Each structure stands twice: as structure tokens, then as C-alpha cells.
Amino acid sequence: HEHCCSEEDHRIVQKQWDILWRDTESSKIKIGFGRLLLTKLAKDIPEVNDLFKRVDIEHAEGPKFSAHALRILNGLDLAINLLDDPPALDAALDHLAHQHEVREGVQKAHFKKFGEILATGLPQVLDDYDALAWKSCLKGILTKISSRL
Amino acid sequence: HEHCCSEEDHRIVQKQWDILWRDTESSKIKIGFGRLLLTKLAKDIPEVNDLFKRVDIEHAEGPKFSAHALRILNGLDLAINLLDDPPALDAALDHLAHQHEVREGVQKAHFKKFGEILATGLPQVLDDYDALAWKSCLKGILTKISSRL
Amino acid sequence: DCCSYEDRREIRHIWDDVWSSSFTDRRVAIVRAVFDDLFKHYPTSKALFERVKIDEPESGEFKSHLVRVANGLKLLINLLDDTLVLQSHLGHLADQHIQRKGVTKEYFRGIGEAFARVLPQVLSCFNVDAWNRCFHRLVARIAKDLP
Amino acid sequence: DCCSYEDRREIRHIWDDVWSSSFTDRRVAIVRAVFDDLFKHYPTSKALFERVKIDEPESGEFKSHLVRVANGLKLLINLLDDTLVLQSHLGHLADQHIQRKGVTKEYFRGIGEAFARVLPQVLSCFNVDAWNRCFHRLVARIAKDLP
Amino acid sequence: DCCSYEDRREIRHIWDDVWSSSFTDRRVAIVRAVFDDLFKHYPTSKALFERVKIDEPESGEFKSHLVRVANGLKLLINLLDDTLVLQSHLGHLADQHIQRKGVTKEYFRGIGEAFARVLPQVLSCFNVDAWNRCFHRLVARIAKDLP
Amino acid sequence: RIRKAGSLRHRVEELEDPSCDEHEHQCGGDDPQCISKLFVCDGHNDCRNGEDEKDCTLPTKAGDKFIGDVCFDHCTKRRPEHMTLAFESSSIAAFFTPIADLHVHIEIESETDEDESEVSMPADGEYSFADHRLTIHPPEEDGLGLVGEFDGYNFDRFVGHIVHELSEEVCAEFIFHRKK
Amino acid sequence: KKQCGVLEGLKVKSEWGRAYGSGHDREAFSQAIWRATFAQVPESRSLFKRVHGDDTSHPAFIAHADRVLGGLDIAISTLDQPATLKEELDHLQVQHEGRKIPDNYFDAFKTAILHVVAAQLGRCYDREAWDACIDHIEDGIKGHH
Amino acid sequence: ECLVTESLKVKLQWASAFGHAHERVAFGLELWRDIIDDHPEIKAPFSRVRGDNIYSPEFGAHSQRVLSGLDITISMLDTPDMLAAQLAHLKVQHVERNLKPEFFDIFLKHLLHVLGDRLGTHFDFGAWHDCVDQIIDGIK
Amino acid sequence: ECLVTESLKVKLQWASAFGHAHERVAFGLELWRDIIDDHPEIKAPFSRVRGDNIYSPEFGAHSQRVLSGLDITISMLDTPDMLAAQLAHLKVQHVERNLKPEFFDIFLKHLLHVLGDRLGTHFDFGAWHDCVDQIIDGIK
Amino acid sequence: ECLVTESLKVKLQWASAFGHAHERVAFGLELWRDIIDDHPEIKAPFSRVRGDNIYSPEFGAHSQRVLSGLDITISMLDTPDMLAAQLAHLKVQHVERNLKPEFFDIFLKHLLHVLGDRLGTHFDFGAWHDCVDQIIDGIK
Amino acid sequence: DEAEKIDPEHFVSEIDARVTKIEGTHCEKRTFQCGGNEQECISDLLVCDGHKDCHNAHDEDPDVCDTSVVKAGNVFSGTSTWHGCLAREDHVTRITITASKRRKFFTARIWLRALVESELERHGENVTSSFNAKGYYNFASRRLILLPTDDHDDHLAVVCSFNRGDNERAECHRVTEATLHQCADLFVTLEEHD
Amino acid sequence: TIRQLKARISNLEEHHCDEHESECRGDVPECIHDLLFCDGEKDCRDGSDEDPETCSLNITHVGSSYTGLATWTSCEDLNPDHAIVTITAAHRKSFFPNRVWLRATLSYELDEHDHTVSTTQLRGFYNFGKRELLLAPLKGQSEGYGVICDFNLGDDDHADCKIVVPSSLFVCAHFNAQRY
């Protein structure tokens, strides 16, 4: 209810997250942004580089990774776009939990960090950003995704 | 006759006189303003000081007078607020005439002066002032109040 | 006397019908026609304008004058919504006539009659009374100073 | 936890009822009434304000203080819509209290209780909870710096 | 003859679909695809752009060129509502091509055909005729000095 | 009496910022509910009410001829007095109620300066269920198309706007009457 | 009940500002109040026989009404600051002393005011507060301390 | 002198720009403010008409009187016989007093700047410069 | 000092002009921008609050803090005991640091320029100049 | 250099600010006016394109041509291979001819001032300064 | 039997009201518009004296004053679509008037208590959230305001307006007191008593 | 009853025409200039005119009276009083589909008290296109007052009258009227 992620709250997030996909070259953006986001993660926590090894994170611009950049960044999209349908969003995220559960090496502390990074990044590409609303929602998402251990 | 003192005329006065009571501390204003108005009267015509002696005009800030400051200033309010109901306003003013008739010492020349003072004062507190409209109305009021003397 | 805001509005419109032409031709003929009525009634005043060459009607030295008079009136009317300023320029307009030796309080009451006889002929729907009322208030203050 | 946008709106209004008038008078009496409740409960803190002369309630050297406190709070609330700036000034507000030797993390939790007891008396329709929530978020960040 | 206003509006819109985002990527591929059709038909012209290194398609020295061309067209279209200015820059645009030794009146009629074959493929709802009409008026004047 | 009253209801349904969307369809009625125009007539029921399935009759028949009287033609050079609209064929997909596809011949009797010209341009088009709005995709390369929105039964009379299909700019209005 | 003192005053003083209003709202506000008063104690109409109390809509009375609220204004507006209030109350005290004025009517008139004010302010209005202050003001006029 | 069209153009644009009633005082004010901020040396001769406080009624009056005269000259322009006369008349009211000639060059600079805002891109700078100039020199 | 009316007038106009919430930040920003463009020498002491980038939150915060104090002073002024105290309090926060005296004369120039835009022709320049001035001197 | 974000930010804001059709001419005009009033020395080289009357079509055309190029550079900007090329191309169109160095520093000053108005407080001064600067030097 | 179901005289009335609903106020708010004869504005409280506000009087005529239609004790149901201040999915609300005091007469104002229920799903089966409310009905306002009593839930206040143009039907919104925002839209209809 | 609804409703949306053009009554929208009525003959193609709703008796009919409560911006110190503009005579001939050119009287109470009442005679016409009744003082009064009443609810009965000053046509007072 109050605790979790308000209608207005996400209605906001959703609106602000859309400022991004106004131009058809979403790929170039999603990639570049997701690329940077993951990079800046491996920067602060290297034990990550080995996890993303499978997707050739070594080559940031390498298609292998660029594709990945999308998948993840695009997953975040899914999460955000289902914010207005808790049961669905729930299911959608639970599924993401399982996709991370079987990937050993990935620990909670990783998400906590990725969250802080994401929160410092968004406001750099979006002129209109409501830190409070976002933090509220991103938390709920990141948590439910890593919930499965 | 009619045309002088018009619906539009007073509709204006009324509107402009309201710019004053926007904030709840009307007392502080009405007092200060009325205080000044009466003071500046005694300044130009001293035989007045003796009339307002009864209300301790000697102590401008003295409650005795401050109260008075209100009563008068507040009476002017009544006058203005009844401008849109001639019969009522009439009665309301006639009554004021009698309240001044039994106060010997008060002569017409006093009002004429008070009028000039009031006309020079209002425009100092009201950014939007229509001298023509006001003079027209203030005249009708001041006159009817002193006519009986 | 006082006048009424509605009346001002009435005039602020009535004028827009006489003024209205952009430039000089019209306003000239009207202001002229006004004076011609002033002179036909108070011939004396005529002499007062030798400075502008009234003996040469089409002079231009005089036409320009007529315009200045017209425009001076225009300026007044177009000030009726800004009271305080009107009240000042109205004074300034007096002083400009007090220093003009030979200008009586009468000549003014005379030019007032003038308009009241001319205007009703140059345009229809002229509220002679409304005009008269506000014109008097204007004249009184102009004239009054001189005495 | 966090602050909802609705709650912010609630406060952005609740405040407009305490602040409202241009006058010091009101805000003063309120902020004062708040401190009087802080001192009646955590009397130790009283001493901290000898610099502003609390021993002279009507001093003016002190009244002005009260106002600064009030206004400092006002500034906070009136920043709730600009997060990023609030987050910074909120820090700056901490530093101004960390360098004030003698200010405990407790005294803050104490002034918080103060408002929650005062405000509900100076105005009706006070969402004590909503206030409490966002006030804590504000205090937490202020205080924390100190220890 | 002069171009119909409706048609201009048609184009002022049709263009907004090809120009599109502020991105180079898109506009590039289109303007390129346009030239490739000019060269496949009037191969002679190819040589004219050695200055910008057409031998290096992905050069960038060339890509930038393509863009300038694109933008130059954009500037034209986005001027169709300010006639007088268009008429001037349209001239200036001619002079920039007259001093370019080797540019025929033909090559232009050729690039005109180019768009009319490309555009209808990059976007739907293309009023080929309307485009053709106003594009010719633009080209004619650009040549126009030159020959 | 029914239609006459229902007709009145419509006039009202038109007033106001509308319950449903332009796109969306208002089920009714006692309790509102908004569903997509695409959305009815799925064959699943949207409506408690059951609107998506009770409106027994398809507005769109077949074979009908409609005569349009011009009244505002920026659009053509000749401006014609009239404009006949003959419906050749009409078929609904077995799965889709919502949209019925049409094939129409737009006939025209103009007088040219020189001679007299006659025309019978053929064009495809559909009729949407809820909208009662038939869109006749432009016969022409030019992409002048017709868009008539019904009252529907009442009246088979429909205002026909000629527009630039892409723009949806209106530039010609004709009142079309069903020829019996 | 609520204590009287500073705050409850500020509240009433403020709310009164909104309820009183001006122009016609006023000419009515008063109208409504008196109608409510007389409806409660028709007996009291006899006191305002001098100012056409028989017809609440007669200019004479309209004036009277608008004139009465006037004082009430001064009262409330001054009221919370003691210095001034003191004066207004004292002033009233005089206009009343010499007469005896039974507490039954004042009661009704208060009720009237309260009901109308409540009708005028809609939602933001503290009853106890007004009751307390209108009382303090009335006491100052009956001067049965 | 100026071209018969180059005048009508100004006579016309002046209309839209200047305006009526209050719209004018606003114009006058905006004008003089920009002028005085650029060259505070002017607050000097405007001492009689409270030039220190341009928002004052005293100055406001003045402001208007000025623009009015400008109106005359402009509507004067169109017909040469009246303009030539009017201009000559203005020159006299000035020559006597001493002024600095450059002040007018300043006044003009702004009058154009302002009309620029009011009229937009349609503003026929050429016409005005050529035309209002002819009114300034005459006075000076 | 002020007059009693000359204050209320400012106290009142300040209300409309300054505004509430965001409307303020906008004001502050507009103000400081005009100030810094006129005298870039100021970007110096504002080094602590990123004065190079006035759009930054760091400076934005500052901007607000400033205006707020100005609000206080303006509110203060009517009641003398509080003003005299408040002013004295401000003098201290300034005396210690070295500053340019003329900076304030600048600040004032713009604060009026801005309020001028916000308030329009109603803006009582007189009242403000006479009144805000008194606030600057005490500080300085 | 610049940052990839610091570009996208400008690329984006340029969009809203510049605008489309007439909205642009208005921008260009407003820009050049402010520039020429500040440094009339520029009316010199703009002699070919009637720089005396910026409202003229001749100049108007120019104005646009300019902004357009600025659009290109900005649009080039993000992707290095195109920018490096575009910039080099601009350098040539300039080197040949005399221009002052400082003129561009001026142009930039205003371009930012104007975008400031258009975009408001959101205007990312930092991003622009860092980014448009790079465009000026190269051509320069 | 079929004939009793379609009253024409009823249907026509639906259209009248339906249309009258389309046909703003000239008057100022919380003012009362008189009848055909003149055209005047009257302040609300004053106009519903309970005694005739005006000469004519608009009020006095029996058609408006008529208690019965107005009278509470009705149950109103309908769907409450949320902006989602509340966590929970859309659903139905059921406002039912518990009690209603006035004077004996007493037209203007009707004080009343009522029961507000919703039928929403928790984890597990269908539940029903009921809270008790107190409030009033404003004859003139054509408004029914229901605030929560002292409940720990303190579920937010409902507000309904008349002019549907049916009497039966009303347009409601859930709102907070303090905020006095609109959290949700709710269109109710009186359920048949039988 | 239904008839009265369709009416009340119909009287109240725009019409295409810019001023002093009116549409032909019938099926076609088409707009013709107000003036051309009458040829005597059908100006219109449609001949919508010839239809009774245009040539009607009642419409033209003289001695229709409209009243409402006049609330004077200007004059009336007192409490807004009853205004009554009633038609005293209006020219027909025989054929004449069209608008009368007419004479009426404007009466408004001095007071309730006084029990007196001003009655000025007027002259003027009725604009078909405008739906507007325009009357002015007949003469010779030199101050007489006049009145403008707009039809266009679409209704008959109801009009938006405003007492003006026959000079400038400036609104002295306004009163929403009904018939009687």
C-alpha cells in the first residue's frame, strides 16, 4: 500500500523513463546506457567481470555484450512498464529472480551497488528526474529480482 | 445625480478597498491607517484634538484610541460595503450623522479636510487607485455623514 | 461635476470615431471646423493665433497648430483611464494657457460649445451629454488654473 | 521509509497554514512554542542558545533567531519538490549544527516530538503521520552528520 | 510557376518523416541512398566529390558531407514559409555550386529523379507529385544562374 | 417512439468530454466501462452489458448507392454539383466482426471547359463497427480520400469529408443521401 | 471545552475573516444570521421595533444588521490582543449598561452566528473555538462579571 | 527626405506598436527605462519631471507627452507641407535650450530596439531609420 | 528609515513577486544570472557554492538561502526591535569576510530590475529603493 | 574532449530551443540582434548580407544559413568521425579569410545567453559551454 | 406487464434531464438561481432560510422541496476506479445511508450517518472493507459528504453530487480532507429497495 | 413532448458561416448571403425557403413580447428590475418569407416602490441570419434607449437581451429573457 510503490510514484517513473525512447534509435541508447551501467558496476566490483565473462564483457562494444546490454536494460524496461499491474510485474520479476539464481557468483551486494549506480546515472540522461519516486520503485524491483538466492 | 456615483464607480471602489484586507492582520492595518488618518487631521486642524480627547487621542498607540481608530475606519468600511444598496447605505449613514450631531465641536470644515486627507492617503497603500471613482463616492459618504451636523 | 465611468467609456469610444482617421486630413478639418465656430461666436479670440498665422488658413504653420490642438485633446481623452497622470498633464495644459496672454476663462467655455455643435455633425451616435459632462470636467481644471 | 509525493503535497499545504502571513509575529510564537516544548523535555539543550540570549525571551536578538530557525525549516519544506537541491542544503544544514558543540542526535529527535505536539494545536487538519514521516527523513540526514 | 501552398504544407510534413530524429544515422543513409542513385545513373558526377573522399564511403570526411547536403536541403524546406529569405538563400545556394567547376544543369535534374525514387521507399504516404513540383521550383533556381 | 427517443439520447452522448475515448468505446450505460474500438467485437465479451454482441445489425450493406450533394469543395478543380457513391462488394472476415471491407466506385459527372467528362474511379475501403465511419482509401495516387461518419441507420444520410488521407485535412464536404 | 487564550483567538480571528467577507456576501451573511436569531426567539423582534425589526429585508434593518456585525468585527479582530480588545469590550459595555439584556437572546444570537459561519466556511472551522470566543465577546457586552 | 511608401509603412507600424491607452504608457516606460540604464547622464535634465523614478506619475506624464509629439511628427511625415512645418516648429522648442546632440542618436537607437520587439521580424528597420532619423535631425 | 506604508507596500509586492516553491528558484536564478553576467568578478567568492554553474544544485541551494534571508529582512523591517536585531545579526556574517562594498549596490540594482519585470508598472520603485537600501547598508 | 552524455544533452536541448520553421528565424534574429548591439564592429564583414538591417530578407537568409551549420556541427558532434571531418571542413571555409578570434568568443557568449532564455533553468550550461566551445575553436 | 416497463413519460424525463445536464452557471458559486420570472442570484444559506428567501419563491414551490425523492436510507453502489492512492485493484463501493437527522421540517441541510463498504480481494478470498461515516447533504449543493468516524482505518472520505439529472444517480469521488484532492472516480446508482 | 425536446435541443454547436450568411434550411448545409432574401423567388437551389418553418406566421408574428430581469451595470442603483421588450408592429407583405422591419416598446420598472415604469418606443428590424432583434429609440427623444436580443439558443422563446445606448450600442444593462 503506502509502503510499497504508489500509483503516483510509478506513474511518474513511467513518464520520466519515456523521455528516453522518443527517438527511433533506442538501440544505440539502451546499449550505450546499459553498457555504461554494467561497466561502472565492474569498475566498483570486479568479481563481476567474471560473471559477465560469458557475454564477452571484456569487449564492451563487442556485439556479444551489446546484445546483453540490451537484454538487461530491456528487462528493466519490462519491469517499469508493468509497474501498473502488481500481479504481472510480480510474476515478471520472480522470473528474473530465477534467471539470476542459477547464475552463481551473483550476490545481493551486487544489486545494492547497481542500484546506487542506476540512481546516479538516470538523472544524467533525464532532465526531469524525481529521485524520491524512482528510488522507491527501483528498490522494489531490484529487491524482488535478487530475492531468489 | 445617478450617474455620479455609479455602479461602475463604486464597484471599482469596493474592489480596490478590498486589496487591503487580503491578510488576516486587518486590525494592525485598520488601526495604523485610521490612526494616521485621524492624526494627520489633528495636525492640520487642532481644535480636533479636543474632540478626540474623550478617546485619549493624546496616546495614539493607546488602546483607548486604537479601539476608536477601528470603530471609525471600520465605519468607513460599512459605508463602502453598503454602496451597492442605496436605501441601506442611506440609513447606515444617516445613523452616522446622528452619532456626530450630538458631538458638539465637530463642524463641516472638518470632514472636508478629512476627505482631502483620505484622498491623499488611500493611494499610498493601494497600488491600484482610481481617484475619480473614489472622490465621487467618498464625497457622497462624507457629506451624508455630516449633513446633520 | 463628477462624471461617471460609463460616460468616460462612452466618450473613449465616440472619439475613436472622429479621431479615427490615421493622419492628418480628417482630424484637421474637424478641429478647424471647431475653431471656425469659436471665432464666429467669440471673434475676439481670433487675434490670439496670429502667432501661428491664422490669416493663412492653409498655411501649414497653422494647420500643424490645429493638429497639435487636436492631438492635445486626443492625449487627454486617451488618459481618462489613468486618472493620476491625467490630473497632472491636465494642470500642465493649464499652465501652457495661463502664460498665453489674452486667453479668457470664457473662450474655453466657448470652444466647449463649439465641439458640442460640430462633433454631432461629423459622426452619428454622439452622446452629446456624456461628452459635455466629461469635457467640462476637463475644461474646468484647464481654465481654472489661470485664475 | 520514503516520502510519497502525495505526502509532500500534504505538507506543502500544511505549511502554508503555519507560515502564511508575511508577519514575523505568527511564525515566531509557533517556533517559540515549539522550543518551549523542547526545553521542558530536554532542559539541557536550553544552555546551547545563550549565544542568542535565550535568557531574554523578548530580546529580539533571540526572536530573530527563532525566525531564522523557522525560515530554515520553511526553506526545507519549500525544497521538497527539488530533491537534488534539498539533498545538498540538507547536508549544509547538518554541517551548521555539527560545528555547534553540544548538539546531540537526541535533541533533534526531541524537537521532532516538539512540532508533532505543537502544530496539531496551531492548525486543524494536520496529518501528524505524514508530517512525522517526512520530518524524520529530514532530521535523520541533518543529525546524522553530527555524530 | 509558383508552388501551391497546400503542396508546400504537404512537403513540410513529408520531410519531417525522412529528416526525422536529430540523429545523423538516418538522414545519412537516406541522402547516401539518394546519391548512390545519382551515381548509378550519371556516373560522371561521382568524380566531383573526390574533394570529400567519396572513395572512402565510411570516411566521415564524406559522411559529414552527406549530412551538410541533407541539412542544406532541410534548411530549404524549413524556409518554404518565409519565401523572401528562401529566395535569397536559394540564390546563395546556386553560387556555391556555380563556383564548383564541373556541376551541370543536368546533374541536378538527375538528383531530383534520385529523391523521387528513394523517398517513396523510406517512408509511406509520399506525395511524389507534390514533392516533385516544389523540388523542381527549388532546383530550377539553384541551377538557374549557372546556366 | 424508441428510435426517436434513442436519437435524442445520441445528441446528448455527443455533448461533453467524453466518457470513453475517441478510440475507446463506451459500453454503457448504467455503469460505464471503456473498451477499445479495436477491442469489441472480438467475440469475447467485453461487456457485462453485452453491447459488443447485441447490436444486431451491421450498418453496412451492399449494393447501396449514395448521392452526395456538394456544399464546400476546396478540393477538386471542377467542384462538382454532385457525386455518386456506388458500393460494388462488401465482405466481413469470419473472425472479425469489427471491420467490414468494401469495394466502391466513385462516379462523377463533370463538365469540363472543353468537353464533358465522366468518371468512375474505384477504391477500396472499410467500415468500422463502432465508429459507423467508413473510410474510402483513395482511389487516386493522389491520396485524396473520402471519410464519411454515420449517424448510421438514421440517417443513411452521412456527411462525407474528402481529405488528404495522410494529413486528415478536410477540404471537401458533401452530404450523402442513400438512393433508394 | 477549549480554553480561551491566544491561539483559539487567532483561529477565530482568521476564520471570521473568511466568513465575514464583503459586499453582498456580507449583506447576506448578516441577513442569514438575524433570520436565524429571530427564528429562535421571535420575542426579541420587539427590541428592534425602532429599526424595522418587523421586516428583516427593510433597508433600515439591513443597515442595522450590517452595523452590528461591524462591532462584532472590531471585537473579534482586536480580540486576541488584550490591550485593544479590552477597549472595544469596554466600549460595548457602555452601549449596553443602563439596560438589562437578558442572556437568553445573546445565547440565540451566538447560535445563529455559529450556524451561519459554519454554513459559510464549509469545512475549515473549529466550533469550540468560536463558541469560546463569541462567548468571551458577549460576556464583555453583558458585563455580568 | 523619405519615400512616400517608406512613410506609410512607418505610419502604419507605429499604429500597431504604439497602441492605445495603457498599452502606451507601458511602451513609453519600457523605452525610457532602457534609455536611462544605458546612459544615466540623462536623468539630469529630466529633473523637473522626476526622472529618478520613471515609474512615478510625474515622469509617466512626461513620457506620454513625448511619445505623443513623436506621434504627431510621424503622422506629420506623410504629407510634406505639414511635416516640414511641424519639424520646423519642433526645432525651435529645442535650439533655445542646449542639449547634447548625441542624446537623440541614443533615443533613436532604443526607439528602434523597442519597436523591434513590439513588431517582430516584420519591423521595417530600413523605413524607420530613414524616416525617424529625419525627425530627429530636425529637432536637434 | 522606511515609512510604514513604504514598507507594507514592499512587504506586499515582495509576496507577489517572490512567489512560492519553484517559482522562487526561478526568480533566484534569473537574478543571479543577470548579476554575474554584469560583473563576473563575483564568481570568485561564490567558489564554495559552485558559482561557475548557477544552474547547479549546489548554487541553487545557495541562491535560495539568500533570497530567504532577504525575505526575513523584508518581513523584519516593520517592527523595529526585530529589524535592528536581524540587521545587526547580518552585519556580523559579513564584516568578518572581506567584501566589496559596491557588490551590494549591484545586487540591489538587479533585484529592482527583476522585480520590475515581475511586478510590471505597479512596481513601487520608490518604496523599494528607499526600503531595500536600508537593508543593504546595515548588512554592509 | 566532451562526454557522450554532455553531447546528447546538447543535441537534445538544441532541438527544443532551435525549433522548426519560423520559430527558427525568430531565434536567429533575436541572437544576431543581441550580438550586434553588443559589438557593432561586426556589422562590417556582414556587409555582403545587409548586416545593417538584420530584419531584411538578405540578412535573414544568412542568419538561417548560419544556424543551420551550427545545427550540423551539433548533430555531427556526438559521433567523432563525422565531427572531426565536419570541423575540419569548417576550418577551411574560415582560414582563408580574416575573422577575429574574439568574435566567436562573443557569438558563443550570446548563443548561450539566448538558449538560456529559451530553455530556462533546465539549460545545461556546463554541457553546452564544454561542447559548443569545441565547435568554435575548430572552425576558428 | 410489458407496458408498465416502458413508461414513455419516464423515458422522456430521462432525456429531459439528460439534456438539461448538457445545457454552466451564470451565477456565482454558492449562489442560488431563481426561477423563470426574474433572473437573480441569492446567497445559498440565506436563500434556504426554510422560510421564503424570495418573493416568488422558487423554493416554496412544492416540486423542488419534495422530501421523498431526496430522502435518504437509500443504498448506492457502483464501480470505484482508482488513480490508485489505494494499493488495490478496481472494485465496487456500496454507500448506504444509516441514519438522517434534521429538524422536523428541515429542508436545507440533512445530517446523516452511513456505511461505506467495498468488495476487494486480499490474499485469500473476497473480503469487505466497511467503515462507518458521518456527514451531511446540501440541498442546494446537491452534494452528499461522508467522512469517516473514529476508526483506526480512517478510510478516506467519499463525496457525491446529485445532478446526474436522475435523482437516483450520483457522481462521487474518494478524497482526503486535508488534501481535498480526488483519489478516485465513483458513479453510483440507487439500488431498488425491493 | 418529444417534439418539444428535439426543439429545445436543436435550438442550442457552431454553424459554418462567418457573419451575415445563413444556411439553407434543408438537407444541404450550403451557405448563402443573408441579403438575397427575398428574390421573391427561391434564392436557393434547395428551395428550403418555401417550407413553412421559414415563411412561418408565428415567427414573423407581431406582438410577441420578451421579458427578463434587467440588472444594470450602468444605471440602476436599485435592485434589478423587470425589462420587457414587446413588438408593436412589423411589416409584412404578402409573400414575404422573411424578416420584418418592425416597431416595439421597451419597458422597465422604476421601482417596486414607486410602482412606476419607463416606456420608450423603438424602431428596428430582425436579422434572420443574426437571429438577432435590433431596436433603437424611434426618435426625437434624443436620448432614447435601445436593445439587442439574440435568439440563438435556437429556441423561439428564449433570448439574451441587452439594453444598449443607441449611440455607441454600448451595454447599459443585461437581461436574459423569455417569451412573455
Instruction: Write out chain D residues lying below 8 Å of I25, CB-based.
Output: 82, 85
As a dihedral over the C-alpha atoms of residue I76, residue I79, residue I82, residue I84, rounded to 10 degrees, the angle is: 90
Kindly state the cell numbers that stand for L71. Answer: 440588472
- CA-nearest residue to J83 within chain E is E64
Residue found by looking up cell 477538386 in the block: F76
Beta-carbon contacts of residue C58 (< 8 Å; ≥ 6 apart): none
CATH code for position E88: 1.10.490.10
Q: Is D21 on the interface with I (CB under 8 A)?
A: no
CA distances from D93 to B17, D98, D112, K115, K152 (A): 43, 9, 16, 48, 36
Cα D83 from chain centroid (whole Å): 18
Asked whether the beta carbons of F58 and F66 are under 8 A apart, the reply is no
Kindly state the cell numbers that stand for L78. Answer: 436599485
Contact H54 I125 (CB under 8 A): yes
Amino acid type, I16: S
Instruction: List, in sequence order, every residue forming a beta bridge with K174; answer none if it has no partner.
Output: K158, K184
Kindly state the cell numbers that stand for G104. Answer: 437568553
Determined by cryo-EM
d(CA I105, CA I108): 5
Is the Cα torsion angle G85, G88, G91, G95 positive or negative in sign?
negative
CA atoms within a 13 Å half-sphere pointing along the CA-CB vector of D26: 22
Give the pairing of strands F144-150 and F82-92.
unpaired
Q: Which residues of F are annotated as a binding site for Ca(2+)?
A: 39, 42, 44, 46, 52-53
d(CA L52, CA L31): 19
Beta-carbon contacts of residue E32 (< 8 Å; ≥ 6 apart): E57, E66
Asked whether the beta carbons of D102 and D48 are under 8 A apart, the reply is yes
Asked whether the beta carbons of K92 and K79 are under 8 A apart, the reply is yes
Instruction: Write out chain L residues lying below 8 Å of F8, CB-based.
Output: 2, 5-6, 9
As a dihedral over the C-alpha atoms of residue A114, residue A119, residue A122, residue A128, rounded to 10 degrees, the angle is: 160
Instruction: List, in sequence order, every residue forming a beta bridge with F36; answer none if it has no partner.
Output: F24
Residue found by looking up cell 558543540 in the block: D101
Phi, psi of C3 (to 5 degrees): -130, 175
Q: Which residues of F are annotated as a binding site?
A: 39, 42, 44, 46, 52-53
d(CA H51, CA F164): 61
Amino acid type, K70: V
d(CA L46, CA E60): 69
Interface size B-D, in CB pairs within 8 Å, comes to 7
d(CA L62, CA L87): 6
Contact H126 J33 (CB under 8 A): no
**What is the number of structural domains in chain E?**
1
Residue found by looking up cell 571542413 in the block: J89
Phi, psi of J3 (to 5 degrees): -110, 160
Give the pairing of strands F144-150 and F158-164.
antiparallel
Domain ranges of chain G: 1-145
**DSSP, res K191:** P
DSSP output for chain G: -PPPSHHHHHHHHHHHHHHH-SHHHHHHHHHHHHHHHHHH-GGGGGGGGGGT-S-TTSHHHHHHHHHHHHHHHHHHHHHTSHHHHHHHHHHHHHHHTTS---HHHHHHHHHHHHHHHHHHHTT---HHHHHHHHHHHHHHHH---
Asked whether the beta carbons of D89 and I65 are under 8 A apart, the reply is yes
> Going along F61-152, which residue ranges are E strands?
65-73, 82-92, 99-111, 116-128, 133-136, 144-150
Cα B1 from chain centroid (whole Å): 22
d(CA H85, CA I3): 50
**DSSP, res I82:** H
Which is nearest to C42 in space by CA: C50, C30, C52, C34?
C34
CA distance B129 to chain C (A): 9
> Going along F1-64, which residue ranges are E strands?
24-26, 34-36
Instruction: Write out chain D residues lying below 8 Å of K84, CB-based.
Output: none
Query: Contacts for B86-93 with beta carbons within 8 Å, 24 or more apart?
Result: B86/L77, B86/L78, B87/G59, B87/G62, B88/G27, B88/G59, B88/G62, B88/G63, B88/G66, B89/G63, B90/B144, B90/G59, B90/G63, B91/G59, B91/G60, B91/G62, B91/G63, B91/G64, B92/G63, B92/G66, B92/G67, B93/B141, B93/B144, B93/B145
DSSP output for C25-55: HHHHHHHHHHHHHHHHH-GGGGGGGGGGTTT
CATH 3.40.50.720 fits H1-140, yes or no: no
d(CA L60, CA L100): 7
CATH of G1-145, one of 3.30.70.1350, 3.90.850.10, 1.10.490.10, 1.20.1050.10: 1.10.490.10
Name the residue range of residue E53's domain.
Answer: 1-147
Residue found by looking up cell 481618462 in the block: C80
If interface means Cβ-Cβ distance under 8 Å, which residues of chain J face chain I?
Answer: 113, 116, 120-126
Instruction: Write out chain F residues lying below 8 Å of E11, CB-based.
Output: none
Cα C32 from chain centroid (whole Å): 11
Amino acid type, I10: V
Asked whether the beta carbons of C109 and C121 are under 8 A apart, the reply is no
d(CA G97, CA D59): 42
d(CA I28, CA I30): 6
Beta-carbon contacts of residue K13 (< 8 Å; ≥ 6 apart): none
Instruction: Write out chain C residues lying below 8 Å of B123, CB-based.
Output: 84
CA distances from B132 to C2, C82, C134 (A): 8, 10, 11
Asked whether the beta carbons of K82 and A7 are under 8 A apart, the reply is yes
CA geometry: angle A35, A40, A43, nearest 5 deg: 125
CA distances from H75 to B59, C75, D69, H10, H18 (A): 62, 15, 62, 9, 13
Which is nearest to L178 in space by CA: K35, K28, K22, K42?
K35
Which is nearest to J12 in space by CA: D20, E22, G65, H23?
E22
Residue found by looking up cell 527583476 in the block: I114
**DSSP, res K52:** B
Is the backbone peptide bond immediately before F174 cis, with ω within 30 degrees of 0? no
Interface size F-L, in CB pairs within 8 Å, comes to 23
Give the pairing of strands K75-82 and F34-36.
unpaired
Beta-carbon contacts of residue L140 (< 8 Å; ≥ 6 apart): none
Helix intervals (H) in H1-140: 4-18, 22-38, 57-77, 80-95, 101-119, 125-139
d(CA L79, CA K38): 12
**DSSP, res L17:** P
Radius of gyration of chain E (CA): 15
Q: Quick count: other Cβ atoms within 10 Å of Cβ L90?
A: 19
Contact B6 C87 (CB under 8 A): no
3-state helix, strand, coil in chain I (%, to 5): 80, 0, 20
d(CA E18, CA E120): 10
Cα L80 from chain centroid (whole Å): 22
d(CA B70, CA B118): 15
Beta-carbon contacts of residue H7 (< 8 Å; ≥ 6 apart): H77, H78, H127, H131
Q: Is B90 on the interface with L (CB under 8 A)?
A: no
Q: In units of Å, what resolution does this entry have?
A: 8.1
Beta-carbon contacts of residue J30 (< 8 Å; ≥ 6 apart): J114
Q: Quick count: other Cβ atoms within 10 Å of Cβ G54?
A: 11
By three-state DSSP, how is residue K188 classified?
Answer: strand
Amino acid type, B131: A
Cα E5 from chain centroid (whole Å): 20
Phi, psi of F15 (to 5 degrees): -80, 125
Indicate the angle between helix axes I57-76 and I22-38, nearest 10 degrees: 100
Contact H82 C60 (CB under 8 A): yes
Q: Is E10 on the interface with F (CB under 8 A)?
A: yes
**SS3 for chain B, per residue?**
CCCCCCHHHHHHHHHHHHCHHHCCCHHHHHHHHHHHHHHHHHHHCHHHCCCHHHHCCCCCCCHHHHHHHHHHHHHHHHHHHCCCCHHHHHHHHHHHHHHHHCCCCCCHHHHHHHHHHHHHHHHHHCCCCCHHHHHHHHHHHHHHHHCCC
Phi-psi region of F50 (alpha: psi -120 to 50; beta: other; left: phi over 0): left
Contact K43 G116 (CB under 8 A): no
- CA-nearest residue to B120 within chain C is C84
